Design a protein around this ligand. Structure first.
Ligand SMILES: [Mg+2]
Ligand SMILES: [Mg+2]
Ligand SMILES: [Mg+2]
Ligand SMILES: [Mg+2]
Ligand SMILES: [Mg+2]
Ligand SMILES: [Mg+2]
Ligand SMILES: [Mg+2]
Ligand SMILES: [Mg+2]
Ligand SMILES: [Mg+2]
Ligand SMILES: [Mg+2]
Ligand SMILES: [Mg+2]
Ligand SMILES: [Zn+2]
Lengths: 118, 25, 92, 60, 206, 155
RNA sequence: CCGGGCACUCUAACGGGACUGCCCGCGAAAGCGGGAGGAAGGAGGGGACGACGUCUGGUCAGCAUGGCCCUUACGGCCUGGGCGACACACGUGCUACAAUGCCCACUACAAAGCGAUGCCACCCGGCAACGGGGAGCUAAUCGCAAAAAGGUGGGCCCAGUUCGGAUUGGGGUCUGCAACCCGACCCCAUGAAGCCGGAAUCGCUAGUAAUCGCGGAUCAGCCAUGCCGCGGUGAAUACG
RNA sequence: CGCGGGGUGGAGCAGCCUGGUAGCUCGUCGGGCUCAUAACCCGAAGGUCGUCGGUUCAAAUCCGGCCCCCGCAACCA
RNA sequence: CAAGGAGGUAAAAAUGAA
């Protein structure tokens, strides 16, 4: 069911199916279905349409999620555009933000190795 | 998941406690 | 022209004139050698008898070695009129 | 910086976190045991001397 | 080479301590520093006595200090000085019961610290070291010893080349625990540097 | 240089069976030193044997081992920078070890989901002479078969 | 928990206890093999102990010390920066790629050590880190600690997936004068690479390898996945 | 200046004629092996195809103009 | 039982330091 921006997860437990949304994770998941009052271990296969409506209405509202909060997150990094701080430059150069070790490692932001040789 | 900060197992390994591992009872 | 240092003491003597990285009695010695390696346009100029010049062997291939004093040698790589990796090392 | 540096180690004023341990027999700042007030080096010397009350070789 | 200090190697069985007091934390550190400063202050103005040991015992403000010496010539009869303020100058940073005793080491030729110290004096007298070693060993061996061994290392007779002079008669088993082996050491200060003298003296046990 | 001929290690007999063999098999199942999980899996699979066949697992397991026994194996030996492969006989100790090892390995090679059903099935297949371990056994004997040429080098 | 008792367990101090002494066989002897003997054996299992000497080995930055040099300075104080830099290369490791596995709940079984300028029971707030209280403990008395793997129950169903946790946004807490460079945790949300490793390369022969947690030193705090120890479950194989 | 052949990674060579794929050996770069070098093993990167035009949907390739290279020819008086 | 004289012999693996 097209809950937020997504619909994908069929026969696979609503507490888990919920996770498949940028903004839900695991904590907001069971938090949303206990506050909506729905059984977590259900089929996800389009069960009681009412439960699905209530779920959708609560989840999609309340807190920001999916493409909207991706925009906000990207905009929070755009904050350090202008004449920003040190943390912005780390987002500029493509290097790790939290001042860690970059002599080795840091491949998750630098990307795969390039090898200079000399 | 000895390095995940959201498990009783990772909380053991890290040492610290919390929500995913309460200080007993 | 000297272009890169590996030895910090050597680096400081030639750049700032800081002599506290080398022996005190080898200050003048090391200086005249470095200036020679700086002015040298080819390895053939670093050939005065008092230098005992020679290229190293094995893993140190591509390097050269003039003699300061006793068991002490200034090693470097000379290439295209320039020396690189100026070090202050031991004969053993 | 060694003589004026074993001065500060006993001087200990100005912010409580700027104060640090320091071997007394030597002037070592590293591996200084709080129990003896000595570095690991000095401690070994005196332990072999016998000048360390009760301190004895460990075999087990 | 690499060999463990024959004193520390015993400590428990054979060869007891040299500073025998008990304390828990918050006290050990202070009392050990004071203890060592006593050893440091004594060694200075008491070297002419040539002290084999500096035993120390404590019992809450009691601080007993036993100074073993070959010839206690620097004590000189009660109020003849060399003891009065001398055993009283300790309590200028102590203020506790400065009970200073003096022992008479009978044979100095059987006291390892004294042997090495006599040798180290001779190095500074510019003596022929190899001959000095030989004599000192025989001198120790002459006074009833079961085994002896003296070692001077480095810069022998000046001359640019660190050497190591070696001599040892009789029996010196360092590996054995029931050993009763006395170990001494001394720094010889020379106008050309510093060299160390080891001295091993051995007697029976079981 | 093996001055001592290294005496054969002896095991503890299991529970309910008394095997001088089953425990050796449970040991191969054992990973990270968890004999509890190891023994459980085997006895679990023993319960599984009872279902698909009306046979006592003490024989099903026994015969399976007997069918996954290498009569002769290939051995690389001397002269020519160790160029030859003399086909050697296999000692009862080694047939023993290979049988159980190949069983467990082939068992975990199977596409099944539970460790017990893999063990049970691989044992039933091996008891018949069908298991992937039996493949391994028959394969090792092929190699030993093709080398009869310089087998006379023996030793 | 009390009365009382301390035979068991434990605690820690001196002892006993195998020396192949005893049997068969081999042998000139030494010794070797084998057997009842007992908890134990033919150095019982681990430590501490490192010959004469070798490497012009290592260390003038622990310390000592010959010589050379510096002294309105190569010394002294301070604030700040740096040792944490990053196109890359190598070492030692940690966490994994899952179902003999992961999550949640319940429920057991250790040893070795550390603590009243601290460990902090038990309550109270808090999703939690933690904060408010506050009892006991100079500690085989009180506390750190519930050991974890295990067991029982239940849920995922093999899918980059409830595997994996990197990276990143946001919100907090604690030490500290202060944590931007550069602190550790907590919580929400993101959830990357990895589906098991080329040529090569390492460790281990019995409580051993593997796997599991626990303590300590340093230490205000902590970048500890390290080092030094402790016990839990517990393999495989040795022809040669 | 007259005919024929040829300019392609750092080096030597293919691919052109039957337009849509640039391949081989060596060398370079990274990693192994060794005390170390060589040899060897693993894994990589690297070419305006001489230049200016033209044809074509598309040119290393098909067609012209120059620019070098190499090989033949230059004879009868 | 105790051997003299007789004969087929390793591999593919090269170098050296300042
Ligand atoms: Mg011994
Ligand atoms: Mg040297
Ligand atoms: Mg010094
Ligand atoms: Mg550093
Ligand atoms: Mg992938
Ligand atoms: Mg998979
Ligand atoms: Mg062994
Ligand atoms: Mg290479
Ligand atoms: Mg090579
Ligand atoms: Mg003609
Ligand atoms: Mg050559
Ligand atoms: Zn010190």
């Amino acid at each position: 069911a097209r809950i937020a921006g997504v619909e994908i997860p069929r026969n696979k437990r609503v507490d888990v199916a919920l996770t498949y949304i940028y903004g839900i994770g695991k904590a907001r998941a069971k938090e949303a279905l206990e506050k909506t009052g729905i059984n977590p271990a259900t089929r996800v296969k389009d069960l009681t349409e009412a439960e699905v409506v209530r779920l959708r209405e609560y989840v999609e509202n309340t807190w920001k999620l999916e493409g909207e909060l991706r925009a906000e997150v990207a905009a929070n990094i755009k904050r350090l555009m202008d004449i920003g701080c040190y943390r912005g430059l780390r987002h500029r150069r493509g290097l790790p933000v939290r001042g860690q070790r970059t002599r080795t490692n840091a491949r998750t932001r630098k990307g795969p190795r390039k090898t200079v040789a000399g | 998941g000895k390095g995940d900060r959201r498990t009783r197992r990772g909380k053991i390994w890290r040492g610290t406690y919390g929500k995913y591992r309460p200080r007993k009872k | 022209g000297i272009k890169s240092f590996k030895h910090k003491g050597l680096k400081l003597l030639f750049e700032k004139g800081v002599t506290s990285g080398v022996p005190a009695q080898d200050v003048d010695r090391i200086n005249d050698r470095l200036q020679a390696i700086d002015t040298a346009t080819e390895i053939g100029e670093l050939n005065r008898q008092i230098y005992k010049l020679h290229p190293l062997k094995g893993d140190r291939e591509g390097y050269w070695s003039i003699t300061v004093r006793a068991n002490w040698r200034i090693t470097f790589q000379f290439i295209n009129g320039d020396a690189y990796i100026l070090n202050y090392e031991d004969y053993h | 910086a060694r003589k004026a540096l074993i001065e500060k180690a006993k001087r200990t004023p100005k912010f409580k976190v700027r104060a640090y341990t320091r071997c007394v027999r030597c002037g070592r700042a590293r591996s200084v045991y709080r129990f003896f007030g000595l570095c690991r080096i000095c401690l070994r010397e005196l332990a072999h001397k016998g000048q360390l009350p009760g301190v004895r070789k460990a075999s087990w | 080479g690499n060999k463990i200090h024959p004193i520390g190697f015993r400590l428990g069985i054979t060869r007891d301590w040299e500073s025998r007091w008990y304390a828990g934390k918050k006290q050990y550190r202070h009392l050990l520093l004071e203890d060592q400063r006593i050893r440091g202050l004594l060694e200075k103005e008491l070297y002419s006595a040539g002290l084999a040991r500096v035993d120390i015992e404590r019992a809450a403000d009691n601080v007993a200090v036993t100074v073993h010496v070959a010839k206690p010539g620097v004590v000189i009869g009660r109020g003849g000085e060399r003891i009065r303020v001398l055993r009283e100058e300790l309590a200028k940073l102590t203020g506790k019961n400065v009970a200073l005793n003096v022992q008479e080491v009978q044979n100095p030729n059987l006291s390892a610290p004294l042997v090495a110290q006599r040798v180290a004096e001779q190095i500074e007298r510019r003596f022929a070291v190899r001959r000095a070693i030989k004599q000192a060993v025989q001198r120790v061996m002459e006074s009833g010893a079961k085994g002896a061994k003296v070692i001077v290392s480095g810069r022998i007779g000046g001359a640019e080349q660190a050497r190591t002079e070696w001599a040892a008669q009789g029996r010196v088993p360092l590996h054995t625990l029931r050993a009763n082996i006395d170990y001494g050491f001394a720094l010889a200060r020379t106008t050309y540097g510093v060299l160390g003298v080891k001295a091993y003296i051995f007697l029976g046990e079981v | 240089a093996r001055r001592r001929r290294a005496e054969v290690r002896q095991l503890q007999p299991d529970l309910v069976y008394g095997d001088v063999l089953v425990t050796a098999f449970i040991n191969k199942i054992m990973r990270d030193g968890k004999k509890n999980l190891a023994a459980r899996i085997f006895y679990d699979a023993c319960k599984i044997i009872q279902e698909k066949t009306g046979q006592e697992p003490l024989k099903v397991f026994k015969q399976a081992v007997e069918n996954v026994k290498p009569r002769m194996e290939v051995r690389s030996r001397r002269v020519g920078g160790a160029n030859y492969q003399v086909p050697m006989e296999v000692s009862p100790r080694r047939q023993q070890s290979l049988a159980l090892r190949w069983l467990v390995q082939a068992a975990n090679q199977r596409p099944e989901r539970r460790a017990a059903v893999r063990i049970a099935h691989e044992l039933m297949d091996a008891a018949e002479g069908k298991g992937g371990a039996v493949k391994k056994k028959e394969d090792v004997e092929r190699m030993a078969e093709a080398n009869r040429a310089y087998a006379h080098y023996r030793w």
